[PDB]
Design a protein around this nucleic acid. Structure first.
Lengths: 115, 153, 68
RNA sequence: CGGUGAAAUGCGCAGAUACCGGGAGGAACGCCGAUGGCGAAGGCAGCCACCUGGUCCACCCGUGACGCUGAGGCGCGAAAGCGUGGGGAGCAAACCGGAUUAGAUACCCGGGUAGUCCACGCCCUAAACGAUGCGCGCUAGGUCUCUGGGUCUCCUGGGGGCCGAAGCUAACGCGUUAAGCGCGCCGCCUGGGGAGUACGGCCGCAAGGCUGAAACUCAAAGGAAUUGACGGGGGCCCGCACAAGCGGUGGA
């Protein structure tokens, strides 16, 4: 217990694992749940179900602190970006709004082989 | 079937009760087309339900079927150079067929002597939600949402 | 189109934000010719122009996503 | 956490990852951006200012044939690569490890030095390609597009595309952006392999480069199209071909 209702849900999606992190208004991480953290260990994480679990188990630690409202943030394109959001939208948390600020370079670091 | 869905064979209802469901089940017991024998099996298995339970076998039969129809199933699939068990919503047609069959396959695996007997007991333990008929049902589903990690194909 | 639903305005006045804003997307990005409704010469200039207004922080360089 | 078809190498309880704030630095410059523009080519894209080339249009004002080409010469000349010095974020030959595999000195994964960015100087090659030397005249149009002038629902000049008369071409194709009909002038070819080698000279710091044979040896080497087969190419369609199902052989 620490009593911090209403916060932020950062969902970081990848082509190898999707993770959530929950933060208080200021931008500080309260609780965070990944894919590999649930139980899965490999190719498994990129599964929409993995994201689903990552997201759900991720809210259950947030209700612990009585989190009620949340603004959702989404980074990157992963397999199941959707599912995690749709997940929290039913986890029991009031969803203020969904935000996408997937980071895009205006051309800088000459990337590696597989672009 | 390549060209069409192919029509589904329509059966003649039972001479006794009159439900085609009946005729369908019997067909399933019948081996070597000795349909006159399998007919008896069912009837004498019915008579066992009368003596052993205060209920009309006609009803007992349906409710037993009704209970083993799995509503979820697996169907392997090669995506990525691998076998991915894709769980899937089973259609009406395929339920009824899977039920009757399992009722039987399970029945003949009973420790009991007389065939009709085996059906009789399987028909009851079914409607009571047990035995193996229902077990061969709960097990498939115990794969349905077991690998539900893949319901995205 | 944006040219059709708008009036007389200078393409070179890099300060007029109340106008330019209609040329950017729901994100900071610059509308494509199909959208703006401009010409070959006209767009070429809007490019240069926003690229300026951006610098004096009057116009963004990028936004975030909304609807939800 | 990362990464893969899967995985591991690696990084994390000196607390990584995901998240907020702050600071350093290098490289590059999303969207606009196009099937676009510019330039002799190589090449050129954040914004600004200075310095500077070329070019197009209108007026038709001036000079009065002052023009074209262009051996050798001179300059320009991608990438990589060489010297001195600076710089080093990301990427990454070589190299270290990881997995794959009959094996892998590879394709996949994690690291990583030259290098890649800058200055000065050298190197000068290339599918440096429209694979199409430069200049002038002439030969139906249609259409899209950049751009300029006009009396601007049309006319007229310059550029980039697609279709196409006549014509041409081995054919594919080309077609007022000529591979058409013609003149000037330069460069280059003269069977394949041996060879872009050998030898000689020139050039370079080196790597090498430019020039560049023959003996021998083969009867071809070669272009474009045809018909087929074939593709771990495509679209579409069939059969107890798979699926679905019942029953079997493989055992005795």
């Amino acid at each position: 217990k620490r009593q911090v209702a209403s916060g932020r849900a950062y969902i970081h999606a990848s082509y190898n694992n999707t993770i959530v992190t929950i933060t208080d208004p200021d931008g500080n991480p309260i609780t965070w749940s990944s894919g590999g953290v649930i139980g899965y260990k490999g190719s498994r994480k990129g599964t929409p179900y993995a994201a689903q679990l990552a997201a759900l188990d991720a809210a259950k630690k947030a209700m612990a602190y009585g989190m009620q409202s949340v603004d959702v943030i989404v980074r990157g394109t992963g397999a199941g970006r959707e599912q995690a959001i749709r997940a929290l939208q039913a986890s029991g948390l009031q969803v203020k709004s969904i935000v996408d600020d997937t980071p895009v370079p205006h051309n800088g670091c000459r990337p590696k082989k597989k672009f | 079937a390549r060209r069409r869905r192919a029509e589904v064979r329509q059966l003649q209802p039972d001479l006794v009760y009159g439900d085609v469901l009946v005729t369908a089940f019997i067909n399933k017991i019948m081996r070597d087309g000795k349909k006159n024998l399998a007919a008896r099996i069912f009837y004498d298995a019915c008579k066992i339900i009368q003596e052993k339970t205060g209920q009309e076998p006609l009803k007992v039969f349906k409710q037993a079927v009704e209970n083993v129809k799995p509503r979820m199933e697996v169907r392997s699939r090669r995506v990525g150079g691998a076998n991915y068990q894709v769980p899937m919503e089973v259609s009406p047609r395929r339920q009824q067929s899977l039920a009757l069959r399992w009722l039987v396959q399970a029945a003949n695996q009973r420790p009991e002597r007389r065939a009709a007997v085996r059906i009789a007991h399987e028909l009851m333990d079914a409607a009571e939600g047990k035995g193996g008929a229902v077990k061969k049902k709960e097990d498939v589903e115990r794969m349905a949402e077991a690998n539900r990690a893949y319901a995205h194909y | 189109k944006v040219k059709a639903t708008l009036g007389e305005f200078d393409l070179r006045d890099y300060r007029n934000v109340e106008v330019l804003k209609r040329f950017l997307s729901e994100t900071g990005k610059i509308l494509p010719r199909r959208r703006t409704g401009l010409s070959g010469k006209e767009q070429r200039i809007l490019a240069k122009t926003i690229k300026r207004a951006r610098i004096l922080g009057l116009l963004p360089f990028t936004e975030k996503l909304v609807r939800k």
